[PDB]
Design a protein around this ligand. Structure first.
Ligand code: NA
Ligand code: NA
Ligand code: NA
Ligand code: NA
Ligand code: NA
Ligand code: NA
Ligand code: NA
Ligand code: NA
Ligand code: NA
Lengths: 173, 173, 173, 173, 173, 173
């Protein structure tokens, strides 16, 4: 049953990739939830909605790239349920950005664990894949979200609806 | 707590839309699974893979349009877990097409039930939405899949790997 | 006699690069042999011929990049005889693809050993060079060849000359 | 006081980045000094001047990229004095190229130490940053300078003013 | 040892130009520090960052033009250490603009002293150089910074983070 | 076992073509070695490197054309080991050009022997092939190399590094 392509690809690595696929799909779902919260008539921040929808689609692309990797290496994809997000109502633009920052840091932590595994199993291809495609993307995402949180807080969010309105227009627009 | 926009939108309809969102997301996931099956080194049918990936992305778009509808009408989106697909290994191009046909008919049945609900609740906007955006799309999908199944069977699939190869090239390519 | 440019470049690494140069040149020669087998009047599969000739030229480019590296680091190139390929007659399209897959996996194994050496000698430049220019290229090559082998086998090669003919036209053309 | 973005970023790494910033700024200053030496009326080698000025600007860009990294990771930039270069009068084109080669090797050594630190602290993002943006750039620079030194020496510099003149025109022009 | 080009160029003028070179390089460094303060995740004012980075690069250009002058006149460049800026943390957009205004006025004062020296040494070329390339540039810079400080203060900075946010967007963007 | 295409193609001719293939591949390897000698940091003559690399690629093309001929005529290609070049270090531009001239004359001698064989076996197609594709190419190559050797010697190579430098720039550049 060993794939004809498989070489230097540990079972533990294969399993970790399947976990990471699920995590990326979960993140995609979280961002989708956030997006549509901002589309509510009682929230009505269109550029927040757009921002999170973009992030949702990006996370899905990340998942798909891991699926591609799994097959490239001769591993086998095993999908799991995609858990629903932790919240239905994301409260405010600031709260959503803070939740996104937390999520991104969680995803980054997983990726760092995956890199450590790859290095421990002497799988340089896998380690390089993670470095090249995932780790700087995460650092950039985290920095961007932190910047957003800073600005929102400085402007007076979430108490000031004017703050979120103007941030939506000037930063996210 | 009633939305300022809400008018003529029954709680039962709102609940049915939330169920349909989940079903579309599930369908998207099924098609994603199928796609990546065909990308395996031991399957290696790239145009089958492409076909199913396209379908996956289309189902996600369908889900998002329902989410948009929910907010347009002043309903509230409640997401649920996305169940994993029924299979990890889809066996053959023919078997996957047959499974897709079954799925599409299941989705269509739900949509017909949703239309009946809308009509029973005297919600012409919702009924029209389903007719306009979903019902002909489903009929077309079902007809296309049936055509594919017919052709594959006539060509000798799944016993003939030459059949699937040539169908991949000439129909799906 | 130490080069003015040399820094952090171990003698063992230098020797391993010279071995890898020879291996790449050998691979180039193998693919050249395969190419011209398919150009025989009694074989006559032009797209197989083209495929392997392309691979031959690619392997030569890989060798030359290693030669460039050797000089960049202040090592010294020592060339060795290029051994003739193991076969004169490659039997069939399927057999050649299987032999190519075996070759590519052998080249990949060497590269993985080179990476391990670089990591053991704390030579991050060399390790990065191998990761960046060689390891994903090999994974991709291996996956492609595996896909080709799968398809040929499914279509009925090598017993079916129709299979190889059609694969030549539709996949390799 | 821990930055909201900070993750997997050791204090030792942060300190090493601040040192590297200073070193790059120092290198920039050295090259600036060299440039303007060649602009003297009693030296008058315009393409040497241009070469070194370009290098000065490149080193500044390198410093700025490290500053960007520091902030991306949630470290804090601490600037130090930029020491004056070791010479005011660089003697000859050959002598300046030799001094540049020595400088570049010193910068490379620091970078290799930084990479080793990153690897020791299990900071793959930082290690990858150094590999991707700094290590091949340094190898290339070192090789180029070595080539220049070789050519100048072979041509008869610094005893032959004709050598430097012609090198300025044909190599650096 | 007198340069073949030197004419009407006093030793005191030569020394004053070397001091001005250092001051311009210092100013460049100050602005660089400011720039990267605004790039911090906990500050996050991108257009402030851009503004100061531009100023940094401009001051470097000013230094280089003085170096060119020194050589044009047959003086000799003597570089000194570039002192680190007075602050690591610039507190606020308003505080940085105020510090910039103070710096620019200090640079202007030096330039006025240089002009007076040139006039006292009957060096019309040098006096004209300073007038043509430096004095109106400084007046313009000072006026611009004063305008910025005025606006920030009127808008409610630094107490209002909304003020700095909006100034960043509308004035500096 | 006689090829269906074979006509008027003597076994001795077939064997001679296989020998010529090996010789062309050998020549290609020699030129590759020379190329990379000139790329060394302690040699650093980029246009010599380029010249020889071009020649390497040309010889490979010559080999491939003979392989094509062999199959066109219904002969069978039998590859042999490619011997390593006689030198690792080619000493100087002049020495390499002299070695190239010697090589080209050796290749020409073989080709003349092949032509004589073809004429003796009354194989006008083969004789014409050699005349049309190989003999004038060799005469031109030999004349060019002789011209290069003459110029290098007249300029003072190899004692004058200025000679090789200038030849590299003006003739080979
Ligand atoms: Na992701
Ligand atoms: Na890497
Ligand atoms: Na659907
Ligand atoms: Na209708
Ligand atoms: Na290769
Ligand atoms: Na640098
Ligand atoms: Na200035
Ligand atoms: Na030839
Ligand atoms: Na003729």
């Amino acid at each position: 049953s060993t794939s004809q392509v498989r070489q230097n690809y540990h079972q533990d690595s294969e399993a970790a990739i399947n976990r990471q696929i699920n995590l990326e799909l979960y993140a995609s779902y979280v961002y989708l939830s956030m997006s549509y919260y901002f589309d509510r008539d009682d929230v009505a921040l269109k550029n927040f909605a757009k921002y999170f929808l973009h992030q949702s689609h990006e996370e899905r692309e990340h998942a798909e790239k891991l699926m591609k990797l799994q097959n490239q290496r001769g591993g086998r994809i095993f999908l799991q349920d995609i858990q629903k997000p932790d919240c239905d109502d994301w409260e405010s633009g600031l709260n959503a950005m803070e939740c996104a920052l937390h999520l991104e840091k969680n995803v980054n932590q997983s990726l760092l664990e995956l890199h450590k595994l790859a290095t421990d199993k002497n799988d340089p291809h896998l380690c390089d894949f993670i470095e090249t495609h995932y780790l700087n993307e995460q650092v950039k995402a985290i920095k961007e979200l932190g910047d957003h949180v800073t600005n929102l807080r400085k402007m007076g969010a979430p108490e000031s609806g004017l703050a979120e309105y103007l941030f939506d227009k000037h930063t996210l627009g």
